[PDB]
Design a protein around this ligand. Structure first.
Ligand SMILES: [Mg+2]
Ligand SMILES: [Mg+2]
Ligand SMILES: [Mg+2]
Ligand SMILES: [Mg+2]
Ligand SMILES: [Mg+2]
Ligand SMILES: [Mg+2]
Ligand SMILES: [Mg+2]
Ligand SMILES: [Mg+2]
Ligand SMILES: [Mg+2]
Ligand SMILES: [Mg+2]
Ligand SMILES: [Mg+2]
Ligand SMILES: [Mg+2]
Ligand SMILES: [Zn+2]
Lengths: 201, 100, 129, 229, 119, 97
RNA sequence: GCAUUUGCCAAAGAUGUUUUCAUUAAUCAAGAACGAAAGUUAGGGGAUCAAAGACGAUCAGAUACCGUCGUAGUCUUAACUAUAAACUAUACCGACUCGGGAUCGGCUGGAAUAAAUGUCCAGUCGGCACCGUAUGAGAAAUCAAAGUCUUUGGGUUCUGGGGGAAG
RNA sequence: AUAGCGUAUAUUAAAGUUGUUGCAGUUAAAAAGCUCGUAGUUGAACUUCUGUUCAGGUUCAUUUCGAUUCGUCGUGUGAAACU
């Protein structure tokens, strides 16, 4: 608990990143702290923080950022993740329609060959993960309690339901990646509001 | 080629289940196997309803005409022929709570 | 009805190696099971293991890495004269180049190799590779 | 258009003479979809004495039937084996309405299917690994094949078909055992192939230690790939 | 029977794709534009293409359209969508915690971090 | 009870070695860092994750840990676990603050 | 195979046990207890249906499907008989390998109320199942066993070896 | 094929189509309608574990060395399973 870390957990809490649906894929058993009277499943936030940083370290690892690929289906993380790809200089799946064959078919128009893949809802974005499975491509996923971890290498426990949550997760990851890349000081605050990544109605 | 896993009858954990005569034909059929639909209909065509509800002597009736209750039990040949149940594709074949 | 505790423990073991599991709880256990494990460990396959004393039979946790391709029991425990060794090493083992057939002898429980070096034989227990 | 323009990252890495050897591709388990990458490592300059000469063989050609809108529509299937007698083998098959077509497509397939057989020692280890490290098993459809290592100069003891496969793999000495309906040639071939492939799947005792940790070719060569050609 | 075909819709997509800055709500303009821009073997064809492309200009004026990706106009539209107040929603120095959230924080020991208001 | 796992990595891996002490083995496969299985030529789903090294200034060092995982492990959804623990034993996780 | 009320008679599982015995167990040629329906023997009974049969109709022909009748049977005492697609067409005892809700019977805590042989929640033991899923199996259909099988051995009975002839 | 070579019949491999090794039995032939049970076959765990010292070989390794030679010998030193 530095001031930095306290700011991190405060941000995470405020964005309500720790609220989950009621189903537990048992694969998630380890990431979930509390099970409430109202059935709400509560995530340990420390695990979230840790995983965010881990992820950032995987992304810093790929030499050339365009070999990292963010994939999102839902409407919330469209905005957030396109901004993410914006600051992170990587590739975005914009069209919510992921084309079967995108990773597998060298003949497709959307054809990509990332070194690392990042998905917003393993459950929604599943076809992407399945394709990654055919190519030897590792995956960082944003993961709710209901989400299958099959073929998922880094789990960041989240609430991938809300804009607030998803957006501030992609945000924090982006900021940490910036830091690791020396595009940003470790001590310095980032002038980009989280509010950008929110989905406007 | 086992067609159904159910084998058509809902019966497990017993050797024997009571046999029921089919409404339509009267053929004996297994109570598990039987296509059974409970019917609450009205005795009368809606037009006919208007006509009668005019003439009802006791004005203290609010929906004061009885419904007709039927527990209808069909042998398979009958419930197929009679379209109560009809042929579906392999995947749909296992669908359990379908109507509207 | 439990017959052959070595068989229980061995199969449960192989199963967990096969499922990529990191360790096995093993119950119940015998001398023979522990000497068999002491053998596989000495020979490089399993890792460290711990014995748990419940007042009755016992339990045994086994750290595995993964090495064991298979480890079986032969039942019945046949009679294996020195003459028959060839048979059993050709029939049971993956290749000449490795893997062991463990036996009880009046000189104790041995890698079939330890048996050629001790010049004895006769009761087959199991194998691992 | 006799010049190859790579559609794969790996394709680029190969054509431009960057990834060293074929086995290296096999090592980093980089998927080969491009049937060029393979002809690369096997040069067509034609020096008659190399055992690295890449060989193609048609094995099967089948008149397959379909009943379609009152017509009976025939195509051809074919099976093809590709191998250098030194360590490397692939098997492929293709359906097409013209024979030489089925053949070409099957050659291409077989190349995409290249696999690293492992060669072991029977008895005392002296010179040329003449056989397999262990006994292993191919499984395709009903069929099973078991490959058991044989002593020096035993030669290949095996049916005409798996024999042909094995010779392409460069296993000199072997014992065979087969279960199932073996006359189904595609399943027999397949089985033998998968079997041969499982050689490297088996964790033998000599594989026990810590492996080398290397960076993938793509991470090393990242600079190259992101130049625009 | 006025359903329009493959050739025509591919065409219209392309014509907008490259030319959107040149294009008008007027058919008669867009048909001449097309004529200059392209090889179209038929009068009839060109006119069908121009009409559909016009139709799609009108559909674009209203909002997003499937099948056509105009990256310039989409990035302009993206900058359009950003608006940020100075306060955000996100106040680090004041944050509100449920009862259950509090229980999990007790578990991690973070229950007391500065600026946390329980509800 | 870690001992066997450590001793396992203690010495280097070797392909087939004849009595003349040559290396005969065409290539030395990578083995998975969790299950310790062999990484196929043909493995569609086997994966090598590189993770960056971090100086106290947040700086990447350009230094990388590579964690190899094998098809069966990712596929069973053990990956998200395996990795974390592999990073423990290498001393890189959890992340300090 | 078993479905109305109540009373009686003996029996049973699961659960609960910091109760007792202490290997007393598993499977099983011999040898035995059961064993739908139909059928048989000797009495009863006989309402419904209803083989045989008598008739109507239908039909080229109907000794059939349909209709009106109707005997044995159907029910019951004592007895025989031993057979079914007697079907999960899936032997029994024992391990071990995925996930998820629900269900029937015990128990253990907890919560609400109108304070109980009732609710809800969380455990768990045993049942009948189901839904996902297998980098497990299979010729497949499919199978959480039909998995832990050429990487072939936990214990034990039974059965098969091209088709007919022929039970 | 060859001074031999056809054919018929029994038998051997082919046959994991008799199966101990080694087969099948939901639907291809195949689990007995069901229980009890004697022969038969089958049977849970525990007992001088262990440690310390000596010697003899037998193996192993080799940044110990040697001698000679087309490879054995001697020697190290430690390391083993022994006896
Ligand atoms: Mg029955
Ligand atoms: Mg055969
Ligand atoms: Mg009578
Ligand atoms: Mg007439
Ligand atoms: Mg009558
Ligand atoms: Mg209670
Ligand atoms: Mg089988
Ligand atoms: Mg399969
Ligand atoms: Mg299932
Ligand atoms: Mg067997
Ligand atoms: Mg039949
Ligand atoms: Mg005993
Ligand atoms: Zn009927």
């Amino acid at each position: 608990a530095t001031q930095r870390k306290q700011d991190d957990i405060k941000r995470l809490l405020a964005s309500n990143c720790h609220q989950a649906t009621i189903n537990l894929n048992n694969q998630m058993k380890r990431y979930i702290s509390h099970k409430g009277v109202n059935g709400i499943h509560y995530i340990n936030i420390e695990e979230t923080w840790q995983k965010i940083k881990l992820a950032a370290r995987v992304i810093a690892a790929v030499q050339h950022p365009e070999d990292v690929m963010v994939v999102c289906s839902r409407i919330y993380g469209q905005r957030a993740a396109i901004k993410f790809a914006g600051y992170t200089h990587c590739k975005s799946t914009s069209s919510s329609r992921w084309t079967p064959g995108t990773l597998t078919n060298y003949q497709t128009l959307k054809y990509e060959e990332p070194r690392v893949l990042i998905v917003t809802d393993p459950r929604s974005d599943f076809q992407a993960i399945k394709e990654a499975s055919y190519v030897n491509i590792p995956v960082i996923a944003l993961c709710d309690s209901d989400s299958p971890l099959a073929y998922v290498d880094v789990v960041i426990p989240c609430n991938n339901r809300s804009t607030e949550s998803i957006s501030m997760i992609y945000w924090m990851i982006a900021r940490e990646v910036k830091i690791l890349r020396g595009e940003l000081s470790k001590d310095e605050e980032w002038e980009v509001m989280v509010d950008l990544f929110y989905h406007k109605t | 080629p086992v067609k159904r896993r159910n084998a058509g009858r809902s019966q497990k954990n017993r050797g024997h289940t009571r046999t029921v005569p089919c409404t339509n034909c009267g053929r004996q059929v297994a109570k598990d196997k039987a296509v059974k639909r409970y019917t609450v209909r009205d005795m009368v065509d809606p037009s006919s309803k208007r006509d009668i509800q005019q003439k009802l002597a006791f004005e203290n009736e609010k929906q004061g005409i009885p419904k007709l209750y039927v527990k209808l039990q069909y042998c398979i040949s009958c419930a197929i022929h009679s379209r109560v149940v009809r042929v579906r594709c392999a995947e749909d074949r296992r669908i359990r709570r379908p109507p509207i | 009805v439990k017959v052959n505790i070595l068989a229980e423990c061995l199969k449960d073991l192989v199963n967990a190696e096969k499922m990529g599991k990191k360790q096995v709880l093993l119950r119940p256990v015998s001398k023979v099971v522990l000497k068999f494990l002491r053998i596989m460990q000495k020979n490089g396959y399993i890792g460290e293991f711990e014995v748990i004393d419940d007042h009755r039979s016992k339990k045994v946790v086994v750290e595995l890495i993964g090495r064991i391709n298979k480890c079986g029991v032969i039942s019945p425990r046949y009679d294996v004269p020195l003459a028959d060794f060839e048979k059993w090493t050709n029939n049971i083992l993956p290749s000449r180049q490795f893997g062991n057939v463990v036996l009880t002898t009046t000189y104790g429980i041995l890698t079939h190799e330890e048996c050629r070096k001790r010049h004895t034989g006769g009761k087959i227990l199991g194998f691992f590779y | 258009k006799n010049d190859w323009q790579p559609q794969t990252k790996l394709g680029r890495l190969v054509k431009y003479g960057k990834i060293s050897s074929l086995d290296e591709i096999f090592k980093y388990s980089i998927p080969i979809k491009e049937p060029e990458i393979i002809d690369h490592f096997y040069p067509k300059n034609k020096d008659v004495q190399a055992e690295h000469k890449l060989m193609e063989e048609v094995l099967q050609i089948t008149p397959v039937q379909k009943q379609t809108q009152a017509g009976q529509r025939t195509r051809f299937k074919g099976f093809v084996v590709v191998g250098d007698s030194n360590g490397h083998i692939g098997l492929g098959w293709k359906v097409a309405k013209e024979v030489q077509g089925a053949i070409k497509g099957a050659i291409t397939h077989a190349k995409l299917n290249m696999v690293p057989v492992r060669k072991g020692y029977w008895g005392n280890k002296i010179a040329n690994a003449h056989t397999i490290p262990q006994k292993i098993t191919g499984k395709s459809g009903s069929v099973r094949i078991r490959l058991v290592p044989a002593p020096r100069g035993t030669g290949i003891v095996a049916a005409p078909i798996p024999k042909k496969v094995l010779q392409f793999a460069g296993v000199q000495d072997i014992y065979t055992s087969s279960q199932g309906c073996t006359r189904t040639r595609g399943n027999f071939l397949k089985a033998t192939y998968y079997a041969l492939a499982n050689t490297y799947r088996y964790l033998t005792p000599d594989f026990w230690g810590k492996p080398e940790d290397n960076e993938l070719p793509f991470e090393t060569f990242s600079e190259f790939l992101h130049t625009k050609a | 029977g006025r359903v329009r075909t493959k050739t025509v819709k591919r065409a219209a997509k392309s014509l907008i794709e490259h030319y959107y800055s040149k294009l008008t709500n007027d058919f008669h303009f867009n048909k001449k534009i097309l004529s200059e821009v392209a090889q179209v073997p038929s009068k009839r064809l060109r006119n069908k293409i121009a009409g559909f492309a016009t139709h799609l200009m009108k559909r674009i004026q209203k909002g997003p359209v499937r099948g056509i990706s105009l990256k310039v106009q989409e990035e302009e539209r993206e900058r359009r969508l950003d608006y940020v107040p100075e306060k955000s929603i996100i106040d680090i120095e004041k944050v509100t915690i449920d009862n259950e959230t509090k229980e999990m924080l007790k578990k991690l020991g973070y229950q007391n971090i500065p600026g946390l208001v329980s509800a | 009870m870690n001992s066997g796992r450590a001793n396992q990595r203690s010495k280097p891996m070797t392909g087939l070695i004849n009595d003349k002490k040559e290396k005969i083995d065409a290539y030395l496969p990578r083995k998975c860092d969790w299950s310790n299985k062999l990484i196929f030529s043909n493995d569609q789903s086997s994966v090598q994750i590189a993770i960056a090294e971090v100086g106290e200034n947040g700086q990447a060092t350009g230094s990388k840990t590579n964690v190899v995982l094998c098809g069966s492990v990712r596929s069973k959804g053990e990956a998200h676990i395996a990795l974390e623990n592999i990073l423990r034993e290498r001393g890189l996780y959890p992340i300090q603050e």
